[PDB]
């Protein structure tokens, strides 16, 4: 019985899968092609676990999950036995996304809850949490993705149809908002920064209004460029939008039971692939 898992994540080396469903449990599997052997079940949430997410193995085996009970739960495998080492629930509503930073930033976490907040939880020397939060969106935040870089930034997708790009500032000590972008007529479900250290940067912003805008910034200066992936509404509401590391392929999880794939061509416009 597992009729509706909401999220699954793969580890750096892809040996250990972590699905999370609505029955609150987070199941860990030892994958091996056809055979993912169930190795664990983790019960510690008071509502459907929306998302799970491993951290960089530089930090051992850590997994921050966020669930409907408004609480972010950090887990850790310890000698082959899992244990909830920390927790961070400074959010007064259902926590939706949770995504670790680039490991060069430390062990930073990115939480994004319906109380219009998004936190960046550091784990200090005592391993204890150091929350520095910001208000992100009015009617709630559905997602928040990290950006790689070599001047840190992230993106957030809102319930007010916004897509925001925040940046760290030593003057403020809290992430200062630097640019917001408007293009959807309904809850911005998911937002994704692309890991392509190439000439430009790409953002795929899927939404409830069955659109997927792509914000391509020329460089550090010139603002973004709006590009409706295709100019027809998808047969059903879109949920997830993920970039590929090698290649800059875009995967779109629409509520129409297939996942589409879009690649950029020399026109600059995007074309299906599969």
């Amino acid at each position: 019985h597992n009729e509706l898992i909401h999220d699954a994540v793969l580890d750096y080396y892809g040996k250990r899968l972590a699905t999370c469903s609505s029955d609150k449990t987070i199941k860990i599997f030892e994958v091996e092609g056809e055979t993912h052997k169930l190795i664990d079940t983790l019960t510690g949430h008071e509502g459907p676990v929306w998302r799970v997410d491993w951290a960089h193995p530089k930090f051992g085996t850590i997994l921050a999950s966020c669930s409907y009970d408004g609480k972010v739960l950090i887990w850790k495998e310890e000698n082959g036995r899992w244990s909830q080492i920390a927790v961070h629930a400074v959010h007064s509503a259902s926590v939706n996304s949770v995504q670790w930073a680039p490991h060069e930033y430390g062990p930073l976490l990115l939480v994004a809850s319906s109380d219009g907040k998004v936190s960046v939880v550091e784990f200090k020397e005592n391993g204890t949490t150091s929350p520095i939060i910001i208000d992100a969106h009015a009617i709630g935040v559905n997602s928040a993705s990290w950006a790689p870089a070599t001047s840190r930034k992230f993106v957030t997708g809102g319930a007010d149809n916004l897509v925001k790009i925040w940046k760290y500032n030593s003057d403020a000590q809290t992430y200062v908002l630097e640019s917001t972008l408007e293009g959807h007529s309904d809850w911005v479900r998911d937002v994704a920064w692309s890991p392509t250290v190439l000439l430009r940067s790409y953002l795929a912003s899927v939404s409830q209004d069955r659109t997927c805008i792509i914000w391509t910034q020329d460089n550090e200066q010139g603002p973004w460029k709006k590009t409706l992936l295709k100019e027809e509404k998808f047969p059903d509401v879109l949920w997830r939008a993920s970039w590929s590391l090698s290649g800059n392929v875009l995967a779109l999880s629409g509520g129409d039971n297939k996942v589409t794939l879009w690649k950029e061509n020399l026109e600059g416009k995007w074309e299906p692939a599969g």
Partner: protein, 113 residues
């Protein structure tokens, strides 16, 4: 509802209520359609044709000399396939010709070539 993100090992997990986990380990469909690429011998002999030097702005490898020729691939393809025709014609037009016999001057050589 569906979910799907890209793997570290660039491949895709999606909701799948037919397996055991509730997800599907999908081998991403490769555009790369050319048989000899999946055989590691080709790659070895292909590395034999290269001279690698470290960069002048970091220690990472980058190619200094290559002796790859359209010619070289031809052994790994059927002489009947249209592909073979492409690679062959490409060899004829682009790969350097050699002219073994010594020539009085070099503009002559050029003419013979």
């Amino acid at each position: 509802y569906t979910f799907a993100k890209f793997s570290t090992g660039s491949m895709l997990l999606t909701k799948d209520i037919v397996g055991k986990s509730g997800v599907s380990i999908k081998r991403l469909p490769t555009e790369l359609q050319r048989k000899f690429l999946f055989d590691d011998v080709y790659l070895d002999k292909e590395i034999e044709k290269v001279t690698i030097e470290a960069r002048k702005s970091n220690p990472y490898p980058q190619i200094s000399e290559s002796s790859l020729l359209f010619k070289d691939a031809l052994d790994y393809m059927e002489k009947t396939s249209s592909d073979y025709n492409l690679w062959k014609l490409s060899s004829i037009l682009f790969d350097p010709v050699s002219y073994p016999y010594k020539t009085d001057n070099d503009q002559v050589k050029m003419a013979l070539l």
